[PDB]
């Protein structure tokens, strides 16, 4: 599939925005 | 006009008009179980036709100077493989399109693929020949 960019709810980005400032993911 | 034509000319004119009016009749008969999709809008259709015309303008000198139908068909086959991959992508993205914005996005992506990658691929092909 391909969710269109205007239809792409960046849920991952949301979870990345709620992430703390020290988690390894941010380092990634 | 119709009043200025004889009987046979009126018959021929009516024949041409009726043969042109096929689709109109078929507009009345629609099927319930078919999978509806948002069609490509007229502006996107014209843009895609313009992209195809640009490709044809690029192709024309080489193929018209080619005297071998085998070579012309080889060029057509390669370009058609590329364009058919892109067409499959476009059809997949348009059939699943939820609205005209999605349909326009897909049509614009296809046109950009023709206008950006298509012209370069065609130019390399024609430089080969």
């Amino acid at each position: 599939e391909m969710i269109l960019p205007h239809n792409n709810r960046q849920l991952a980005r949301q979870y990345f925005d709620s992430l703390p400032e020290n988690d390894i993911n941010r380092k990634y | 006009n119709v009043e200025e034509m004889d009987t046979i000319q009126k018959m021929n004119y009516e024949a041409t008009v009726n043969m042109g009016r096929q689709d109109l009749i078929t507009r009345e008969y629609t099927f319930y179980s078919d999978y509806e999709f948002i069609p490509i809008q007229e502006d996107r259709k014209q843009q895609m036709e313009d992209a195809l015309n640009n490709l044809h303008k690029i192709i024309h000198p080489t193929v018209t100077q080619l005297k071998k139908k085998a070579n012309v068909q080889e060029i057509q086959d390669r370009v058609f493989r590329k364009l058919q991959g892109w067409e499959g992508e476009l059809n997949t993205c348009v059939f699943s399109a939820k609205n005209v914005r999605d349909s326009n996005f897909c049509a614009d992506r296809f046109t950009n693929r023709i206008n950006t990658e298509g012209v370069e691929f065609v130019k390399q092909i024609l430089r080969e020949y």
Partner: protein, 58 residues
Amino acid sequence: TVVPTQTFYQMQDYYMLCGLRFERWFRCDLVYHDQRHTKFDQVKNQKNYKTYPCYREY
């Protein structure tokens, strides 16, 4: 001749030849069927009449 008769000239019954010729004509038609009344013999301005490309195969 676009589709030769010599493909199945051994047979006095032209059933395979009929099938092959109709197959070729149907390919041509699928290419050109919906442009007939706007670009070919079925146009309203018959002074601009151009032969339908699948006439010979038909």
